Short mmCIF file of C-alpha atoms and ligand atoms in Angstrom, two decimals:
data_model
loop_
_atom_site.label_atom_id
_atom_site.label_comp_id
_atom_site.label_asym_id
_atom_site.label_seq_id
_atom_site.Cartn_x
_atom_site.Cartn_y
_atom_site.Cartn_z
CA UNK A 1 157.54 140.62 0.62
CA UNK A 2 160.61 141.07 4.06
CA UNK A 3 163.48 139.06 3.38
CA UNK A 4 163.30 135.38 4.96
CA UNK A 5 165.69 132.78 5.89
CA UNK A 6 165.52 129.16 6.07
CA UNK A 7 166.83 127.43 9.54
CA UNK A 8 167.17 123.80 10.27
CA UNK A 9 165.85 122.25 13.42
CA UNK A 10 166.97 119.88 15.83
CA UNK A 11 164.78 117.53 14.16
CA UNK A 12 165.75 118.38 10.82
CA UNK A 13 162.48 120.08 9.67
CA UNK A 14 163.48 123.45 7.63
CA UNK A 15 161.43 126.32 8.49
CA UNK A 16 161.30 129.83 6.97
CA UNK A 17 161.40 132.60 8.77
CA UNK A 18 161.73 136.48 8.48
CA UNK A 19 165.32 137.50 9.22
CA UNK A 20 163.43 140.45 11.13
CA UNK A 21 162.70 138.43 14.53
CA UNK A 22 161.61 140.92 17.48
CA UNK A 23 159.59 138.86 18.93
CA UNK A 24 159.34 135.49 20.74
CA UNK A 25 158.18 132.68 22.84
CA UNK A 26 159.98 129.49 24.22
CA UNK A 27 157.89 126.75 25.77
CA UNK A 28 159.16 123.24 26.84
CA UNK A 29 161.70 122.12 29.29
CA UNK A 30 164.88 124.29 28.73
CA UNK A 31 163.88 126.39 25.94
CA UNK A 32 163.32 129.67 28.07
CA UNK A 33 166.77 128.94 29.48
CA UNK A 34 168.95 128.69 26.22
CA UNK A 35 167.08 132.34 25.37
CA UNK A 36 168.16 133.50 28.77
CA UNK A 37 171.97 132.09 28.09
CA UNK A 38 171.82 133.60 24.58
CA UNK A 39 171.33 137.26 25.97
CA UNK A 40 167.02 137.53 24.40
CA UNK A 41 165.34 137.51 26.96
CA UNK A 42 163.68 141.39 26.20
CA UNK A 43 162.77 139.34 23.01
CA UNK A 44 160.37 137.08 25.15
CA UNK A 45 156.32 137.94 24.87
CA UNK A 46 154.92 135.04 27.03
CA UNK A 47 156.12 132.57 29.44
CA UNK A 48 154.55 129.17 30.76
CA UNK A 49 152.82 129.47 34.08
CA UNK A 50 155.52 127.08 35.43
CA UNK A 51 158.31 129.79 35.60
CA UNK A 52 155.73 131.18 38.62
CA UNK A 53 154.34 128.08 39.63
CA UNK A 54 157.49 126.98 40.66
CA UNK A 55 159.99 128.90 41.54
CA UNK A 56 163.10 127.00 42.59
CA UNK A 57 166.24 125.21 41.10
CA UNK A 58 166.37 127.34 38.08
CA UNK A 59 169.29 130.13 38.27
CA UNK A 60 167.98 131.30 34.73
CA UNK A 61 164.42 132.40 36.74
CA UNK A 62 166.36 133.98 39.22
CA UNK A 63 168.76 136.41 36.93
CA UNK A 64 165.14 137.21 35.00
CA UNK A 65 162.69 137.47 37.11
CA UNK A 66 160.71 139.91 35.07
CA UNK A 67 160.09 136.54 32.89
CA UNK A 68 157.56 135.27 35.40
CA UNK A 69 155.24 138.93 34.63
CA UNK A 70 154.84 138.37 30.79
CA UNK A 71 151.23 137.02 29.55
CA UNK A 72 150.48 133.30 29.48
CA UNK A 73 151.32 130.98 27.05
CA UNK A 74 149.82 127.74 28.61
CA UNK A 75 150.71 125.78 32.12
CA UNK A 76 154.29 124.77 30.64
CA UNK A 77 155.89 121.93 32.96
CA UNK A 78 156.76 118.27 31.61
CA UNK A 79 154.47 117.10 28.52
CA UNK A 80 152.22 120.50 28.76
CA UNK A 81 151.92 121.71 24.95
CA UNK A 82 151.34 125.89 24.51
CA UNK A 83 148.01 127.33 24.42
CA UNK A 84 147.32 127.56 20.82
CA UNK A 85 144.94 130.83 21.11
CA UNK A 86 147.49 132.67 23.60
CA UNK A 87 150.02 132.13 20.69
CA UNK A 88 148.02 133.44 18.23
CA UNK A 89 147.09 136.59 20.31
CA UNK A 90 150.80 137.17 21.01
CA UNK A 91 152.12 136.41 17.38
CA UNK A 92 155.69 135.81 18.48
CA UNK A 93 157.62 135.92 15.08
CA UNK A 94 158.97 132.45 16.25
CA UNK A 95 158.35 129.50 18.79
CA UNK A 96 161.41 128.21 20.10
CA UNK A 97 160.29 124.38 22.05
CA UNK A 98 161.85 121.64 23.38
CA UNK A 99 160.65 117.58 24.00
CA UNK A 100 158.79 117.26 20.90
CA UNK A 101 158.33 115.23 17.74
CA UNK A 102 157.51 116.01 14.25
CA UNK A 103 153.99 115.89 14.12
CA UNK A 104 153.79 118.13 16.95
CA UNK A 105 155.73 120.98 16.02
CA UNK A 106 153.87 121.00 12.76
CA UNK A 107 150.65 120.87 14.38
CA UNK A 108 151.36 123.85 16.28
CA UNK A 109 153.04 125.83 12.80
CA UNK A 110 149.85 125.10 11.22
CA UNK A 111 147.20 125.82 13.65
CA UNK A 112 148.88 128.83 15.20
CA UNK A 113 150.49 130.18 11.44
CA UNK A 114 153.75 131.32 13.34
CA UNK A 115 157.32 129.41 12.84
CA UNK A 116 158.12 126.66 15.06
CA UNK A 117 161.60 125.53 16.18
CA UNK A 118 162.87 122.39 17.66
CA UNK A 119 165.74 123.01 19.90
CA UNK A 120 167.22 120.17 22.05
CA UNK A 121 169.01 119.37 25.02
CA UNK A 122 170.19 115.91 23.36
CA UNK A 123 172.19 113.29 25.86
CA UNK A 124 171.73 114.57 29.41
CA UNK A 125 174.52 112.22 30.10
CA UNK A 126 177.56 115.08 28.98
CA UNK A 127 178.79 118.42 29.21
CA UNK A 128 179.43 118.55 24.94
CA UNK A 129 176.34 117.20 23.48
CA UNK A 130 176.68 118.16 19.89
CA UNK A 131 172.84 118.69 19.96
CA UNK A 132 172.98 120.99 22.72
CA UNK A 133 175.34 123.50 21.14
CA UNK A 134 173.74 123.06 17.78
CA UNK A 135 170.69 124.64 19.67
CA UNK A 136 172.38 127.23 20.80
CA UNK A 137 173.96 128.40 17.60
CA UNK A 138 170.69 128.33 16.03
CA UNK A 139 169.06 130.34 18.28
CA UNK A 140 171.73 132.86 18.12
CA UNK A 141 171.44 133.10 14.15
CA UNK A 142 167.55 133.12 14.70
CA UNK A 143 167.94 135.80 17.12
CA UNK A 144 170.91 137.55 15.98
CA UNK A 145 173.16 136.43 19.14
CA UNK A 146 175.65 134.31 17.10
CA UNK A 147 178.91 135.63 18.90
CA UNK A 148 177.08 135.35 22.04
CA UNK A 149 176.16 131.98 20.85
CA UNK A 150 179.86 130.86 20.12
CA UNK A 151 180.81 132.24 24.08
CA UNK A 152 178.15 130.67 25.69
CA UNK A 153 179.40 127.15 23.60
CA UNK A 154 183.37 127.84 24.10
CA UNK A 155 182.64 128.78 27.98
CA UNK A 156 181.12 125.68 28.24
CA UNK A 157 183.60 123.39 26.05
CA UNK A 158 186.72 125.51 27.76
CA UNK A 159 184.73 124.37 31.18
CA UNK A 160 184.84 120.47 30.51
CA UNK A 161 188.58 120.84 28.95
CA UNK A 162 189.93 122.50 32.17
CA UNK A 163 188.18 119.85 34.64
CA UNK A 164 189.72 117.14 32.57
CA UNK A 165 193.20 118.86 32.62
CA UNK A 166 192.85 119.20 36.70
CA UNK A 167 192.18 116.05 36.84
CA UNK A 168 194.76 114.08 35.00
CA UNK A 169 197.05 111.24 36.56
CA UNK A 170 195.45 111.45 39.72
CA UNK A 171 194.27 108.23 41.49
CA UNK A 172 189.99 108.29 41.10
CA UNK A 173 188.40 107.32 44.64
CA UNK A 174 185.21 105.64 44.80
CA UNK A 175 181.81 108.16 44.82
CA UNK A 176 178.48 108.26 45.33
CA UNK A 177 175.48 110.81 44.20
CA UNK A 178 172.24 110.51 46.04
CA UNK A 179 169.28 112.59 46.15
CA UNK A 180 168.61 112.88 42.73
CA UNK A 181 165.01 114.53 41.71
CA UNK A 182 162.99 111.92 39.27
CA UNK A 183 159.86 113.30 38.73
CA UNK A 184 159.55 114.23 42.64
CA UNK A 185 162.09 114.40 45.17
CA UNK A 186 163.84 111.33 46.49
CA UNK A 187 166.49 110.11 49.27
CA UNK A 188 169.58 108.15 49.08
CA UNK A 189 168.83 105.47 46.89
CA UNK A 190 168.02 108.29 43.90
CA UNK A 191 171.31 108.17 41.43
CA UNK A 192 172.78 108.55 38.75
CA UNK A 193 175.38 106.10 36.31
CA UNK A 194 177.64 108.03 33.96
CA UNK A 195 177.00 111.21 36.21
CA UNK A 196 178.24 114.31 34.17
CA UNK A 197 180.41 116.26 36.98
CA UNK A 198 182.14 112.65 38.39
CA UNK A 199 182.72 111.29 34.69
CA UNK A 200 184.72 114.76 33.77
CA UNK A 201 186.65 114.23 36.90
CA UNK A 202 186.85 110.14 36.47
CA UNK A 203 185.63 109.69 40.01
CA UNK A 204 185.24 106.16 40.15
CA UNK A 205 180.96 105.81 40.65
CA UNK A 206 180.32 102.85 42.62
CA UNK A 207 176.65 102.55 40.61
CA UNK A 208 178.65 103.10 36.87
CA UNK A 209 177.94 98.83 36.64
CA UNK A 210 174.54 100.13 36.02
CA UNK A 211 175.40 101.83 32.93
CA UNK A 212 173.68 105.00 32.15
CA UNK A 213 171.23 107.84 33.26
CA UNK A 214 169.01 107.82 36.82
CA UNK A 215 168.62 104.58 38.93
CA UNK A 216 167.15 103.68 41.83
CA UNK A 217 169.41 101.06 43.67
CA UNK A 218 168.68 99.25 47.10
CA UNK A 219 170.44 101.21 49.37
CA UNK A 220 171.68 98.02 51.18
CA UNK A 221 174.22 97.99 48.48
CA UNK A 222 176.10 100.92 49.62
CA UNK A 223 177.31 99.09 52.37
CA UNK A 224 179.39 96.65 50.00
CA UNK A 225 180.21 99.46 47.97
CA UNK A 226 181.11 101.72 50.52
CA UNK A 227 182.03 104.89 48.62
CA UNK A 228 185.10 107.20 49.79
CA UNK A 229 182.91 109.93 49.66
CA UNK A 230 179.17 110.98 48.99
CA UNK A 231 177.64 113.84 47.39
CA UNK A 232 174.03 114.95 48.38
CA UNK A 233 171.88 116.71 45.63
CA UNK A 234 170.27 118.89 47.69
CA UNK A 235 167.13 118.58 46.72
CA UNK A 236 166.55 115.40 48.09
CA UNK A 237 168.81 116.60 51.21
CA UNK A 238 165.49 116.89 53.22
CA UNK A 239 164.41 112.91 52.51
CA UNK A 240 168.04 111.82 53.18
CA UNK A 241 168.01 113.62 56.68
CA UNK A 242 164.67 112.11 57.73
CA UNK A 243 166.36 108.53 56.88
CA UNK A 244 169.23 109.19 58.65
CA UNK A 245 167.47 110.05 61.92
CA UNK A 246 165.21 107.01 61.36
CA UNK A 247 167.89 104.87 60.29
CA UNK A 248 171.41 106.24 61.97
CA UNK A 249 172.73 102.79 62.55
CA UNK A 250 173.14 101.86 58.37
CA UNK A 251 174.45 105.84 57.61
CA UNK A 252 177.16 105.74 60.72
CA UNK A 253 178.33 102.16 58.83
CA UNK A 254 179.56 103.94 55.71
CA UNK A 255 182.92 104.88 55.75
CA UNK A 256 182.32 108.39 54.06
CA UNK A 257 179.97 108.79 56.95
CA UNK A 258 182.70 108.03 59.60
CA UNK A 259 185.30 109.98 57.83
CA UNK A 260 182.64 113.69 57.55
CA UNK A 261 183.44 113.17 53.71
CA UNK A 262 179.07 113.98 53.31
CA UNK A 263 178.67 116.75 51.08
CA UNK A 264 175.86 118.72 49.47
CA UNK A 265 175.80 119.95 46.22
CA UNK A 266 173.02 121.84 43.90
CA UNK A 267 170.61 120.51 42.03
CA UNK A 268 170.99 120.76 38.42
CA UNK A 269 168.84 118.56 36.51
CA UNK A 270 165.03 121.20 37.41
CA UNK A 271 163.39 121.66 33.85
CA UNK A 272 166.25 119.87 31.97
CA UNK A 273 169.78 120.78 32.19
CA UNK A 274 170.66 123.81 34.19
CA UNK A 275 174.39 123.85 32.87
CA UNK A 276 175.64 126.65 34.82
CA UNK A 277 174.76 124.59 38.08
CA UNK A 278 175.76 121.53 36.87
CA UNK A 279 179.66 122.90 36.20
CA UNK A 280 179.74 124.41 39.24
CA UNK A 281 178.74 121.59 40.94
CA UNK A 282 181.56 119.63 39.04
CA UNK A 283 184.22 122.34 39.99
CA UNK A 284 182.84 121.70 43.97
CA UNK A 285 183.20 117.64 43.53
CA UNK A 286 186.56 118.49 41.91
CA UNK A 287 187.71 120.59 45.03
CA UNK A 288 186.72 117.69 47.37
CA UNK A 289 188.39 115.00 45.49
CA UNK A 290 191.56 116.43 44.04
CA UNK A 291 192.31 119.57 46.42
CA UNK A 292 195.35 119.90 45.00
CA UNK A 293 194.58 120.35 41.74
CA UNK A 294 191.90 123.16 42.71
CA UNK A 295 194.14 125.43 45.24
CA UNK A 296 193.08 128.47 43.35
CA UNK A 297 189.20 127.75 43.20
CA UNK A 298 187.01 128.77 45.44
CA UNK A 299 184.15 126.43 44.29
CA UNK A 300 181.02 129.40 45.64
CA UNK A 301 182.91 132.07 43.76
CA UNK A 302 183.33 129.81 40.86
CA UNK A 303 179.82 128.93 40.83
CA UNK A 304 179.00 132.77 40.94
CA UNK A 305 181.60 133.60 38.05
CA UNK A 306 179.69 130.77 36.12
CA UNK A 307 176.27 132.26 36.83
CA UNK A 308 177.52 135.89 35.73
CA UNK A 309 179.29 134.65 32.37
CA UNK A 310 175.88 132.78 31.41
CA UNK A 311 173.22 134.66 32.98
CA UNK A 312 174.39 138.23 34.01
CA UNK A 313 173.94 137.77 37.77
CA UNK A 314 175.41 136.37 40.46
CA UNK A 315 172.34 134.04 41.77
CA UNK A 316 174.50 131.24 43.83
CA UNK A 317 173.35 133.36 47.16
CA UNK A 318 169.97 132.62 46.56
CA UNK A 319 170.38 129.20 45.15
CA UNK A 320 171.94 128.23 48.89
CA UNK A 321 169.37 130.12 50.71
CA UNK A 322 167.28 127.55 48.61
CA UNK A 323 168.87 124.19 48.38
CA UNK A 324 171.66 124.69 51.30
CA UNK A 325 174.68 125.50 49.24
CA UNK A 326 178.31 123.40 48.92
CA UNK A 327 179.47 122.11 51.78
CA UNK A 328 180.22 119.50 53.95
CA UNK A 329 176.78 118.01 55.65
CA UNK A 330 176.27 117.21 59.31
CA UNK A 331 173.51 114.55 59.35
CA UNK A 332 172.66 114.67 62.82
CA UNK A 333 171.79 118.63 62.81
CA UNK A 334 170.98 118.90 58.92
CA UNK A 335 173.58 121.99 58.60
CA UNK A 336 175.73 122.21 55.60
CA UNK A 337 179.08 124.03 56.78
CA UNK A 338 179.75 126.18 53.99
CA UNK A 339 183.07 126.87 52.80
CA UNK A 340 183.82 123.61 53.41
CA UNK A 341 185.69 121.01 51.25
CL1 CL B 401 172.65 127.46 35.17
NI1 NI B 402 163.51 130.51 0.59
#
């Protein structure tokens, strides 16, 4: 008879787990990311095929590439469940899972005989979701990473506070973000209302009239909104560039284009939120909109400070090689002018 504890997961399920935890699996969008942030990668005994098959957009897998070599626990990806026989064979002490319901968690736990803990990123429209922080704390307790959990959450909270502080009292310019991935890549018409990097900087997002979350808009409305600054999420950059080449007159009529105020940002939404990348993007956008309040911030160095803290490796360079990196975009050539704002 070994010592156990009872843990209340993000669905309010009480789960009994031995206190001695050494072997884990993390499945569903962003579950493995949180384990990476908690420095518990060496406990991971199986991995979704997704990590190797879809290699881009995720700092954690660039920081911990050895995870790709572990035995399969299933395909992964959105809407997939782990392979139960793989779980039974690997016998982790606990399975962490995201984006499932109680029925599903119960079924996996009962069929495998392995404790299942549901984690949650909660609302993706904020840097301070309490379910996300709770998830980090809870996995921290279960994994013996409690101090590290507090540190991760505090880092995120302080970054939010710092961005608010730096932006306090400045006039808010009009802005737009396009190119946002949403079940596939999209171009200029794919945006977001209540976009967290904008919201923390109180930027006047021209689509915020639409409410919150992902939006597809009529790009003719851009001609009326005429945002002072345009940010292109680099998951959609190729599509935007192709659109530009086909519709040069449309784009050249926008004041953002006229003034060279079109910039590339790194994608952060791949397999739910890459929190480091989202924060790095907010520092880059802040420097662009409010340069006097960011004179001490080199956005590329800051991205690597973030990644080094959360993931222990300076992966910005690899991200910039995948997507382009931070800088003004020259729409005719498709080049990113790195080190510009
Ligand atoms: Cl990240
Ligand atoms: Ni008990």
